[PDB]
Ligand binder design. Structure first.
Ligand SMILES: NC(=O)c1ccc[n+]([C@@H]2O[C@H](COP(=O)([O-])OP(=O)(O)OC[C@H]3O[C@@H](n4cnc5c(N)ncnc54)[C@H](OP(=O)(O)O)[C@@H]3O)[C@@H](O)[C@H]2O)c1
Ligand SMILES: NC(=O)c1ccc[n+]([C@@H]2O[C@H](COP(=O)([O-])OP(=O)(O)OC[C@H]3O[C@@H](n4cnc5c(N)ncnc54)[C@H](OP(=O)(O)O)[C@@H]3O)[C@@H](O)[C@H]2O)c1
Ligand SMILES: Nc1ncnc2[nH]cnc12
Ligand SMILES: Nc1ncnc2[nH]cnc12
Lengths: 198, 178
């Protein structure tokens, strides 16, 4: 029986309960033995100043610590240059050569992955799961510009992804509470390091 | 004057969406405290003691949240005019703000003694996005107690939907499984 590993890729600025719900749901639905959270090292620059990678890594560790089936990888953080998912999966394939990999991320990010990165490598390395919030309307036809390999892509709606990291950052900047949006431990970490209150 | 939130609901189970909503309303309306009030109840509803205890577990860590037994101890059906009359007596010099799901509050004119309701408190309805009385949209209310019960019954996880402590409470008392 091959091990089945989720690879949960995100910038996580901050990680929030929506991400955790999504990973837990996908792990159960796809019978995953473990979910490996991989915070981005250097996410693509958007028109936005991302917290230092070490802060995002620690928040992800804090958030996932209590789950026996979650862990955190530094694979992207400890690779120089912009983060690309072919590289993420090559590294994890190396560290887990006998495992079946399932890469999990937001539906919108998965569209970007498929539009820029090489499909031959991507679908040789893993299957893909796109998770989306209520009201987000994307078809599997629209997530790619062409037909995808057989069982290569699944899409999963997760109601708790109504919670967004952007909303958490704005609230923190406005000195509005992020209790219950964001895990205990992470709330206090955000505040004492003043990550968004600047 | 002191400003008190009154967070009314059946809470079967209480979940992180409820906690998010109460936290936002308390901040937005500068409430000194939010009192959670589990509804009295006779669709098989979990016994009132279990719903009360889950709500206590869920709110314990917040210095400004507490839980009242006023509805479950009254006996018989819950009417909010009774809830507010009880709390008005318990806190005679407080401005009350009654908070619950906007879908519930939509029928307030059909609730018992609506005339007295609007003299006793201000009303705040919290809703998920896409939705006298103020309305507050709360993205986290995409999480619903119905979804939590369905999952638990199907032996699917409710981690992170429901607070720590409440997850394990639900399972060890087999509330929805079976
Ligand atoms: N165009 C790109 O940015 C791009 C290109 C190639 C590869 N990737 C990979 O795509 C993944 C996401 O990168 P990002 O987080 O930087 O994209 P993002 O553009 O910051 O976020 C895009 C959307 O996806 C959601 N999201 C991101 N990761 C998620 C996750 N693990 N679970 C659920 N929802 C998630 C975000 O919600 P929140 O804000 O709530 O997370 C947001 O709504 C990373 O592994 C990254 O290496 C991204
Ligand atoms: N005659 C009356 O005076 C009268 C009549 C009806 C209701 N009420 C009062 O209305 C309140 C709701 O009763 P219910 O909970 O039994 O209604 P419900 O019909 O069980 O649920 C109605 C909707 O409201 C949501 N909800 C309930 N309480 C909430 C809260 N505190 N914050 C956010 N969403 C909430 C539910 O989501 P979840 O399932 O996720 O909570 C559901 O979507 C109680 O205080 C009840 O006494 C009074
Ligand atoms: N899935 C899980 N199993 C056990 N303990 C947990 N704590 C948080 N998530 C958990
Ligand atoms: N709003 C809050 N203030 C202080 N400690 C808390 N713990 C959980 N919620 C809290």
């Amino acid at each position: 029986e091959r091990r089945r590993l989720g690879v949960m890729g995100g910038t996580f600025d901050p990680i929030h309960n929506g991400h955790l719900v999504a990973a837990s749901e996908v792990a159960d639905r796809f019978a995953l033995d473990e979910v490996i959270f991989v915070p981005t090292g250097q996410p693509w620059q958007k028109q936005r100043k991302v917290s230092p990678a070490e802060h995002r890594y620690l928040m992800t560790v804090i958030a996932t610590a209590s789950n026996p089936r979650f862990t955190v990888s530094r694979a992207d953080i400890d690779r120089g240059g912009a983060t690309y998912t072919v590289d993420t999966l090559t590294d994890l394939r190396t560290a887990h050569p006998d495992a079946d990999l399932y890469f999990i991320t937001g539906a919108d990010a998965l569209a970007s992955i498929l539009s820029w990165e090489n499909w031959e490598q991507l679908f040789t390395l893993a299957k893909f799961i796109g998770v989306s919030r209520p009201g987000y309307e994307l078809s599997s036809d629209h997530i790619a510009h062409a037909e995808l390999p057989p069982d290569g892509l699944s899409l999963v709606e997760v109601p708790a992804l109504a919670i967004s990291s952007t909303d958490c950052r704005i609230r923190a900047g406005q000195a509005r509470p992020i209790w219950y949006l964001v895990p205990d431990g992470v709330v206090q970490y955000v505040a004492k390091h003043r990550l968004y209150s600047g």
